[model samples]
Target: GSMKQLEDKVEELLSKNYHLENEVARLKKLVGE
Candidate 1:
């Protein structure tokens, strides 16, 4: 049960990381341009 919860959290973090990369790219473009 704990392991399953941990796995879910890891999956959520991965999804958040994907969104974060897009946000970072947008900010970089704004600052560079």
Candidate 2:
């Protein structure tokens, strides 16, 4: 309910994005096959 509360949602998005990056790394092995 305040201007400073956006970090709560922002951090969640950042964390989710970070996990997605690793998901890409593990799946990268399929590229050469």
Candidate 3:
């Protein structure tokens, strides 16, 4: 159960991280443009 919970949290974090990275990239492009 702990392992499963950890896995779930890691997946959530990965998703959030991906979105954050995308947001940062978009912001950078906007500023550059």
Candidate 4:
């Protein structure tokens, strides 16, 4: 309800996206070009 909580949610999602992006890159490397 508060802007602070919304910002906190966005921050959480951003961190998750960052982690998943790293995982994707690792998988791509494993699969090769």
Candidate 5:
């Protein structure tokens, strides 16, 4: 793939990972109660 496409993919993955991390934390916090 071209550099532009690879960079876009990386950005997408990072954004997805950030959201997943937040979701996990939120679920864990709910369970902690």
Candidate 6:
């Protein structure tokens, strides 16, 4: 892939990771109490 394409893919992965991380935090909160 070109440089821009790789950067775009990385950005997408980061966005998904942020959402997944938030989801994990929510799940952990539910399990804690």
Q: Which candidate has the highest TM-score of all?
A: 6
Model 4 clashing-pair count? 0
Candidate 2: Cα lDDT at 20: 96
Instruction: Give me the runs in candidate 4 sitting further than 4 Å from their true place.
Output: none
User: What is each predicted model's overall lDDT from 0 to 1?
Assistant: 0.93, 0.80, 0.96, 0.94, 0.94, 0.94
Query: Compared to the true structure, candidate 5 yields what TM-score?
Result: 0.72
TM-score of each: 0.61, 0.60, 0.74, 0.78, 0.72, 0.78
Which tens-of-lDDT digit does each residue in 1-33 have in candidate 5? 698899999999999899999999999999988
Q: Cα deviation in Å at residue 7, candidate 2?
A: 0.8
In model 1, which range of ten residues has the least summed lDDT? 14-23
For each predicted model, how many residue pairs clash, with residues at least 3 apart or on different chains?
0, 0, 0, 0, 0, 0
Q: Which pairs of residues clash in candidate 2, taking residues 3 or more apart in a chain or in different chains?
A: none
- Steric clash count of candidate 3: 0
Candidate 3 per-residue lDDT over residues 1-33, each given as its tens digit: 998999999999999999999999999999989
Candidate 4 per-residue C-alpha lDDT over 1-33 given as tens digits, one digit per residue, 9 for 90 to 100: 698999999999999999999999999999986
**Residue 1: error of model 2 in Å?**
5.7
Candidate 3 lDDT at 17 equals 97
**Residue 32 alpha-carbon offset, candidate 4, angstroms:** 1.7
Candidate 2, residue 14: the lDDT equals 85
- Full ranking by TM-score: 6, 4, 3, 5, 1, 2
Query: Candidate 6: where is the Cα deviation over 4 Å?
Result: none
lDDT of candidate 6 over 1-33, digit per residue (tens): 598999999999999999999999999999877
Error of 3 at 18 (Å): 0.7
Candidate with better lDDT, 1 vs 6? 6
